[PDB]
Structure formats: C-alpha cells, structure tokens
Symmetry: C3
Subunit: 37 residues, 3 copies
C-alpha cells in the first residue's frame, strides 16, 4: 500500500469527521427545539 492511496483515505476520513460534526450540531439543535416546544 502506497502513501498516495493511503492519503486519499486519510483525507476522506477527515472530511467525514467534519460531516459528522455538522450532523451532531444539527441534531442537537433539533433536540433543543423539541425540548422548548
């Protein structure tokens, strides 16, 4: 396994961590809307 292909995956995982953070932010916002509804 070469460095280039491995970095492709590292870049994707980092991207997904960002996607997960955004999803967590959205779900937590929804949770607050329901708690105060």
């Amino acid at each position: 396994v070469s460095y280039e292909e491995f970095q492709v995956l590292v870049r994707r995982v980092d991207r997904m961590e960002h996607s997960i953070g955004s999803i967590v932010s959205k779900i937590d916002a929804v949770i607050v809307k329901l708690e105060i509804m």
Copy 2:
C-alpha cells in the same frame, strides 16, 4: 500494510459514507417537519 487489510478499511469507509448520507436525509426530514409544524 498489505492490500487486503487496507481494502477492509476502504470498504468500511465507503459503507460509513452511505450511513452518513442516510442520517443526513433523516435529519433534514425532521428539520422540515419542525419548520412546518
């Protein structure tokens, strides 16, 4: 690091991207339900 083990991880990341897409679809649906409630 061999190709076989690396592909196991590549397959898992691809699977997780699908899981993330589904989660995003669900959260966006919930967001719309709250906006029109």
Copy 3:
C-alpha cells in the same frame, strides 16, 4: 505505509462508527417524539 500510521486510521474509523451509532440513536429518538406529538 507502516503499521503504526495505518492503525491510527483504523482506530479513528472505529471511533467514528461509535459516533455514528450514537447519532442514529438520537435521531431515531427525535423521530419517535415527532410521531407521537
């Protein structure tokens, strides 16, 4: 690509699967709250 660096990524993916499971649990809980509201 060495074993050490590859394991760093394997550990992170495993962590993210846990993060995804928690997000799925939260979104499913929200979905039920809306269905019974």
